[PDB]
Design a binder for this molecule. Structure first.
Ligand SMILES: Nc1ncnc2c1ncn2[C@@H]1O[C@H](CSCC[C@H](N)C(=O)O)[C@@H](O)[C@H]1O
Ligand SMILES: Nc1ncnc2c1ncn2[C@@H]1O[C@H](CSCC[C@H](N)C(=O)O)[C@@H](O)[C@H]1O
Length: 463
């Protein structure tokens, strides 16, 4: 039994947290797992009345020895899960705990959310703080029964919690805050102390609809494994480092307008807009790509806009853009000359096009390369011929560079990093995700080594 294991464990065995908890001056507070009263004394000094509870007799007795002089505390030795624990429903302004749910089974956490919402009055708060993430228990002794859960579990249990009064008003919990104890630092290892603040609200939601919405988002998230390999914000060759190199060639001036054809999740667009004070118009055929772009754009003050659109059918007025930019997108486009003629009209006189794209050697594709091209739906040309297409469309000063050596260098570095981080990659993602990346990068390196696959950089300008 969980109860016996946790009780046995516990038988053998601050200003920041208080600053985080909802206002408690004058209020009715229930402290669960009070221990010897590290918080109890502080709470009581401002609270109207406190109930301090712990299932270890000696702990709660020590609490009473130290804090008993505060006459507004009632002390209880009880297990929070016990049916015999009697606390008047709707009587509590604030339920406070600090390390507690980690000592309950998964089903008991669900039980406790229900007990807690019952105990708190409408408009009241629940605060809890737990040690999270499985790896937090790697160095744990076999007889340490502490549950180090993924934070998503606590969020989901409490967001689905529902109850009724008599008769028969529905109540749920809204999430007021989720906070990292000691302040969140990006990429910082071992930040596992997390707290939540929930408020009891009058509402009846359909949890199946919420699960549906979350599941739609989860299904759309495959692109994140590619972002992991390329770099935050990027889903093509070389991430930020290649983007910085190529954007420099545009000579972007403040106030210019850039079209990004195949904008993906927007990282290159944020980079251009923020660093060069240009307006970027980004289009991508994928709803899911644009969803991430829009989300990462929230809060940014740079001038970017994103739309789901097919670049082969989208229309813009003549002379709309100073620059048309595209990275590893146009291999999907079957009629490049038509696309380029459209680019020529969209660009203002004096404008510029910059494209990187997958290409092939001039030689006829091997049967294996041809089948790959067909399955993927690609339209590949040699670098010189691609350049000629830009010339044919009316562009001047066409530069067409074979950058395959750079492509290979970048592929090798991208693959090596994933391989060296295999365990974490798999924990964050999955084994199948890891295999997809390693397999795909290995195959690209095979096709480059055979001499069949190429990578090109194209720059041209208009009149
Ligand atoms: N099911 C349960 N019912 C009541 N108390 C419990 C419990 N499971 C664990 N506890 C108590 O929860 C406390 C956790 S340690 C933290 C104590 C205090 N909240 C503070 O932060 O200082 C322990 O004292 C333990 O005895
Ligand atoms: N006809 C089309 N119109 C617009 N985008 C297209 C398209 N065909 C393919 N794409 C998009 O082209 C993108 C290529 S991946 C690269 C995205 C981004 N430029 C970056 O470098 O990170 C994909 O997101 C894909 O959805």
């Amino acid at each position: 039994e969980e109860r016996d294991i946790q009780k046995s464990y516990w038988m053998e065995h601050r200003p920041e947290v208080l600053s985080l908890i909802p206002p408690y001056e004058g209020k009715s507070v229930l402290e669960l797992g009070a221990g010897i009263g590290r918080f109890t004394g502080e709470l009581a000094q401002k609270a109207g009345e406190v109930i301090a509870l712990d299932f270890i007799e000696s702990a709660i007795q020590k609490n009473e020895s130290v804090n008993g002089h505060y006459k507004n505390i009632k002390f209880m030795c009880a297990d929070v899960t016990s049916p015999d624990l009697k606390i008047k429903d709707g009587s509590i302004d604030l339920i406070f705990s600090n390390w507690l749910l980690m000592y309950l089974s998964d089903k008991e956490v669900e039980l406790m959310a229900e007990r807690m919402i019952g105990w708190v009055k409408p408009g009241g708060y629940i605060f809890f703080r737990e040690s999270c993430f499985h790896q937090s228990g790697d160095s744990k002794r076999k007889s340490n029964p502490t549950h180090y859960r993924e934070p998503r579990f606590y969020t989901k249990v409490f967001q689905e919690c529902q109850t009724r009064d008599a008769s028969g008003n529905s109540f749920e919990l809204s999430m007021v805050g989720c906070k990292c104890i000691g302040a969140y630092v990006k990429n910082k290892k071992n930040q596992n102390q997390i707290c939540w603040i929930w408020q009891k609200v009058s509402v009846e939601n359909d949890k199946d609809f919420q699960r549906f919405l979350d599941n739609v988002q989860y299904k759309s998230s495959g692109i994140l494994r590619y972002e992991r390999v390329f770099g935050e914000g990027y889903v093509s060759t070389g991430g930020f480092e290649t983007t910085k190199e190529f954007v420099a060639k545009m000579d972007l001036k403040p106030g210019q307008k850039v079209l990004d054809v195949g904008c993906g999740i927007g990282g290159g667009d944020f980079y251009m807009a923020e660093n060069f004070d240009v307006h970027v118009v980004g289009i991508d055929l994928s709803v899911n790509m644009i969803s991430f772009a829009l989300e990462r754009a929230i809060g940014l003050k740079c001038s970017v806009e994103f739309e789901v659109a097919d670049c082969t059918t989208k229309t813009y007025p003549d002379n709309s853009f100073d620059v048309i930019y595209s990275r590893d997108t146009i291999l999907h486009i079957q009629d490049k000359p038509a696309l380029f003629r459209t680019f020529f009209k969209w660009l203002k006189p004096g404008g510029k096009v910059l494209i990187t794209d997958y290409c092939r050697s001039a030689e006829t594709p091997s049967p294996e390369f041809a089948e790959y091209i067909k399955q993927r739906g690609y339209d590949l040309h040699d670098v010189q011929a691609y350049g000629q297409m830009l010339k044919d469309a009316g562009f001047d000063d066409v530069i067409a560079e074979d950058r395959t050596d750079q492509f290979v260098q970048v592929l090798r570095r991208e693959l090596e990093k994933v391989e060296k981080e295999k365990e974490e990659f798999i924990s964050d993602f999955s084994e199948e995700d890891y295999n997809d990346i390693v397999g795909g990068w290995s195959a690209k390196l095979e096709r480059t080594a055979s001499g069949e696959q190429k990578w090109g950089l194209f720059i041209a300008d208009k009149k």
